[PDB]
Amino acid sequence: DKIIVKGARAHNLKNIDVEIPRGKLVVLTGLSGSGKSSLAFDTIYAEGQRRYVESPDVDAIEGLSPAISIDQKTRSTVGTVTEIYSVIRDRLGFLQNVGLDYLTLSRSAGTLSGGEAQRIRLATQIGSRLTGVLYVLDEPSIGLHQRDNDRLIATLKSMRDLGNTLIVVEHDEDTMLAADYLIDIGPGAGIHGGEVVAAGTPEEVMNDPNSLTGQYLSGKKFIPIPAERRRPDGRWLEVVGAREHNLKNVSVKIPLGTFVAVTGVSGSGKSTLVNEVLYKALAQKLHRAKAKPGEHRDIRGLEHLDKVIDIDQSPIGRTPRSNPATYTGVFDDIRDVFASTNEAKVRGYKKGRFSFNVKGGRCEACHGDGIVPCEVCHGKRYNRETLEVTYKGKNIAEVLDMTVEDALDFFASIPKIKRKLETLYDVGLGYMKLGQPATTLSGGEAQRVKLAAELHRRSNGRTLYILDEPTTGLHVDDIARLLDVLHRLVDNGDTVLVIEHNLDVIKTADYIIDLGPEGGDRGGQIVAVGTPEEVAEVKESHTGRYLKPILERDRARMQARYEA
Amino acid sequence: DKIIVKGARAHNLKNIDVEIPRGKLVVLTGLSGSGKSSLAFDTIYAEGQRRYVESPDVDAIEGLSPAISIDQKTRSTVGTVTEIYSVIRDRLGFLQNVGLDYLTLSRSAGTLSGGEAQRIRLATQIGSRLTGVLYVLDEPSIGLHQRDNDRLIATLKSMRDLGNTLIVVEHDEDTMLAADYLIDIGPGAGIHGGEVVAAGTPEEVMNDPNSLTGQYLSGKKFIPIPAERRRPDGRWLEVVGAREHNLKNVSVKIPLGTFVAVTGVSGSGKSTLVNEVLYKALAQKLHRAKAKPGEHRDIRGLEHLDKVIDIDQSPIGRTPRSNPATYTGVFDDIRDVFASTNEAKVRGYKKGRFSFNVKGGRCEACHGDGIVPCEVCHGKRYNRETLEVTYKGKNIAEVLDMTVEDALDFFASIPKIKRKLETLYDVGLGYMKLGQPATTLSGGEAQRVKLAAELHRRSNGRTLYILDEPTTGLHVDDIARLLDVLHRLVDNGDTVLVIEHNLDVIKTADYIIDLGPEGGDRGGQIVAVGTPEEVAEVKESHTGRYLKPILERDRARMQARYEA
Numbered sequence A, B: 001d002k003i004i005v006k007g008a009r010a011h012n013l014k015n016i017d018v019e020i021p022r023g024k025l026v027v028l029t030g031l032s033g034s035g036k037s038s039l040a041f042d043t044i045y046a047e048g049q050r051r052y053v054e055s056p057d058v059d060a061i062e063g064l065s066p067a068i069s070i071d072q073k074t075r076s077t078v079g080t081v082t083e084i085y086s087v088i089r090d091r092l093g094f095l096q097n098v099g100l101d102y103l104t105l106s107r108s109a110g111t112l113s114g115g116e117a118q119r120i121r122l123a124t125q126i127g128s129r130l131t132g133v134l135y136v137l138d139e140p141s142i143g144l145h146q147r148d149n150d151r152l153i154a155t156l157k158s159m160r161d162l163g164n165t166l167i168v169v170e171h172d173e174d175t176m177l178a179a180d181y182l183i184d185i186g187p188g189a190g191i192h193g194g195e196v197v198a199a200g201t202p203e204e205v206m207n208d209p210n211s212l213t214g215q216y217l218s219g220k221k222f223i224p225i226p227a228e229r230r231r232p233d234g235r236w237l238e239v240v241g242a243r244e245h246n247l248k249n250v251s252v253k254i255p256l257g258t259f260v261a262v263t264g265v266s267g268s269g270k271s272t273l274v275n276e277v278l279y280k281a282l283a284q285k286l287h288r289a290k291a292k293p294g295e296h297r298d299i300r301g302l303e304h305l306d307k308v309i310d311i312d313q314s315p316i317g318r319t320p321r322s323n324p325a326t327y328t329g330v331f332d333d334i335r336d337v338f339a340s341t342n343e344a345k346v347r348g349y350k351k352g353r354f355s356f357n358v359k360g361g362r363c364e365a366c367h368g369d370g371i372v373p374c375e376v377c378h379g380k381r382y383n384r385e386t387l388e389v390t391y392k393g394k395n396i397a398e399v400l401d402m403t404v405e406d407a408l409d410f411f412a413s414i415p416k417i418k419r420k421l422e423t424l425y426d427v428g429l430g431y432m433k434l435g436q437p438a439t440t441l442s443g444g445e446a447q448r449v450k451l452a453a454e455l456h457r458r459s460n461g462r463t464l465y466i467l468d469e470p471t472t473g474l475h476v477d478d479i480a481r482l483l484d485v486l487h488r489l490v491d492n493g494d495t496v497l498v499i500e501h502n503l504d505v506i507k508t509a510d511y512i513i514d515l516g517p518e519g520g521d522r523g524g525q526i527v528a529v530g531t532p533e534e535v536a537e538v539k540e541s542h543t544g545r546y547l548k549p550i551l552e553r554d555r556a557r558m559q560a561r562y563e564a
């Protein structure tokens, strides 16, 4: 009745042993990049699936069952994917259970969000009615409003009660609290994670002082409600007559210089309004982008902007020669430091010598890629003679092998470099190596690198930043860092607009645009606008109804602490 | 905790509902062709595997788990198949557990018996250490001596106790008695089977008067011990200096005009002596067969034989135009009957008109194949005008659509046809359609068709029949029929030699040649020869040790019945 993992070493896992109870709803949590993903998927799921299919770096796994993953890793349509040939009767019910009743059967699978695709996959799997299976789920709350949280949990417990084991990788409060058993992975992330910090009932995890997760679940840590909301400064964008998909001829004003959250249940029209209409219309007017925007009459207030930038979880680059140091430009500052050493000068090495993208200093066998690791440079990317030049006893490959946090100390006497490294540290990437290849960064890591570069950029207040569900993949502690960074962009007078369901984010927003009231044909209207406090009071707003008790909970936690 | 099958219709299954308890050793039994195979494999295993792989004619199946089959349906070697690169340490132990410790790691997988291949597959599967799996096993006792029966049962119960369900298709007494739950399928076979006759504990099945299986388990029915053993009549074959594989320079005499059983544990040298040496040497001397015989000095007594015939479970033909009626030649007798009808005469139809193998009377669209069923003849194989000729109101396609037993009644006034049909009835194929295509016959069916044709053949007493494990696939009631037929061949003065582990067969033998004492390097010697009673007394003979209590059990049952 237990899955026994012994000596798990995948990625950053530190040769760990873990017991997971079978026939239970088990949640694995931790920071983004803690190793929770390596444990659930690269280790447990991979081994369980491999063993059945016969018909990962680990010593032994005992008590495995044949495993099925439910993630986004899987022109067809909704109808073809669920084999069903607006939401024969059996399947349709499962689509409703996973919160997808607003989808049409004709919908291109290629145009579903990742959260939608994941939930179609979940529906198909519930349809199988299998027992004795080990299900491994990645973050099933993605794309789901707090209102649908209870039904998701009930759906998971129903699969469990059929006689299956559920391993759920999550950061969502309610899911963790509803778990049979909860495992906190990683003190930190990467090199700083990969350990079992705490394991037991949610209640036992809350009472464990070592557990970062337990400290947030118990209230010892929380994201505060901001003292004041920023007020509009007279600059508005206005979307006029938005009609794309289910949007009911919507007009709405967006205040610049504020942190704006677009909210609403799944299928309410959030992504249509923001991605299909606003982003595409702005990108076409501002950057001459090709993509045809969704149906709308007009967008006013374009005189206020120079640029629109969507920050998503797509890669920062396509080669190993791209990394966090090259993306932020801290790489070029480092090359300048090496070029300024006595030994570089004596040898006549200019900055170009310390670039792995040009002939001279790079390893010529791998053209500076490092890669199987190149037999010549062993992945260091530079030839032997270049590597003899050191700054403070370190060569350029050793520098690129430093974590952001160690590089911060190492470059303490170079302000320009410090300032760039601080942005990466502040976004939550202190653990990451400067030279980590773009090809190996997770989605969340890539979004955070991009945010770090934006934070550094000189601002004129004329940029609109758009982020579609940026809390995807993030622990509440990661979210605190994300919010710190996003609010700092707004302080420059730029505008941050997020599509979110996460109430930790929403409660810190200056301004909310709530769509609905429901999804599909029953959505596409503006339900409420205003501050979190204003939306909290609107009875017809599902977002408000769930937001109100969060504002109250976290105001009370603030007032309890002032009682110091 | 139950697998619920509702409305199963595969092959001969008669729209049945069945409950199978989960986490148990469940045995499905019945006659050969009862439908037990259609239930376990075509229905339960197929659905369980299909459902997992997404990641059969049946209404619904509830409580399925991902399913793994253990049969013979799966140049590589023992080493490569178990991935192991005489019986790293983990796997070797499993090969011992399944009774394969005499195998070498270099052995060609292509030269393993079906029973050996099945047990390698079983070993690999135990190696997986999976839980929550539904295992479906076809006849795992194939090739296994009674001595290894207890260990096989312990091995199965160990897989169950790991937390799996075992559905075992079997006819073996001890396996049935050791079952948690036992299901008796089919009153008869084919059209006469496909129903759940009895289901419960083995004890409950024994106490059910409807159950053919229970009647044999309880002793109400049994195969008797013959009154007298046939004595040699002066004709002997002698194998001289057999050295192939593990055979220790063996010389042994075989008495013709008797029923001979070659016995011994797995790997003792049975198939080497009989198939590799005896059969190949005789086939080369008598029929100029090409295959090089195994190493031996000589074979004496060839003056006594005209032919050697191996009867196995390979197909009777390769096309649909081959069937039990064509193989036995009863087809040609039927064509004669049609050619003799008034209407055939009036029309000038000769016997050739009623052959689907020649132009004129056959359906020309499918060249007489019947096949998707041909859109023209609808599978009847003949054109419209031929089908207008009837005998006793039936046309030739209707005759071919008759079961052997119905055809027996229908042709009651044609002795020649009756005599051929009786052979098929006597081998146990009363249920089978005369025209059933060779391409659709099971292994056991094909062997039985061949035996029927042999039984009909005029004999000079100069044939040696060899059968390698002919009880494969057979219920003890099927075995009684098989033995009746084989003993009738011996009555003609021909010789029947079987390789067997089945003690129901062995106890009826006139003469036993027992190899061993163990398998592999520890086998290859003649342990004992003589009557069953003589071998029963030999302490060093594993065959004798298990045979003795069977002779006693069944002699006592005979004496109890005489107390009528």
Ligand SMILES: Nc1ncnc2c1ncn2[C@@H]1O[C@H](COP(=O)(O)OP(=O)(O)O)[C@@H](O)[C@H]1O
Residues within 6 Å of the ligand: A102, A103, A104, A107, A108, A111, A245, A246, A264, A265, A266, A267, A268, A269, A270, A271, A272, A273, A519, A520, A521
């Ligand atoms: N490409 C498309 N084709 C057809 N219908 C779509 C498409 N994209 C979105 N919709 C429909 O429009 C409605 C709003 O969808 P969406 O904007 O994705 O909601 P949200 O982003 O708030 O979850 C939904 O009912 C959805 O089924």
Ligand SMILES: Nc1ncnc2c1ncn2[C@@H]1O[C@H](COP(=O)(O)OP(=O)(O)O)[C@@H](O)[C@H]1O
Residues within 6 Å of the ligand: B102, B103, B104, B107, B108, B111, B245, B246, B264, B265, B266, B267, B268, B269, B270, B271, B272, B273, B519, B520, B521
């Ligand atoms: N083709 C082969 N190559 C190597 N060894 C073999 C081959 N066939 C049989 N043997 C070995 O000879 C011994 C006797 O095998 P076999 O005659 O198949 O035993 P039985 O038929 O009694 O089970 C076994 O130990 C087996 O491993």
Ligand SMILES: [Zn+2]
Residues within 6 Å of the ligand: A363, A364, A365, A366, A367, A368, A369, A370, A371, A374, A375, A376, A377, A378, A379, A381, A382
């Ligand atoms: Zn190189």
Ligand SMILES: [Zn+2]
Residues within 6 Å of the ligand: B363, B364, B365, B366, B367, B368, B369, B370, B371, B374, B375, B376, B377, B378, B379, B381, B382
């Ligand atoms: Zn035809």
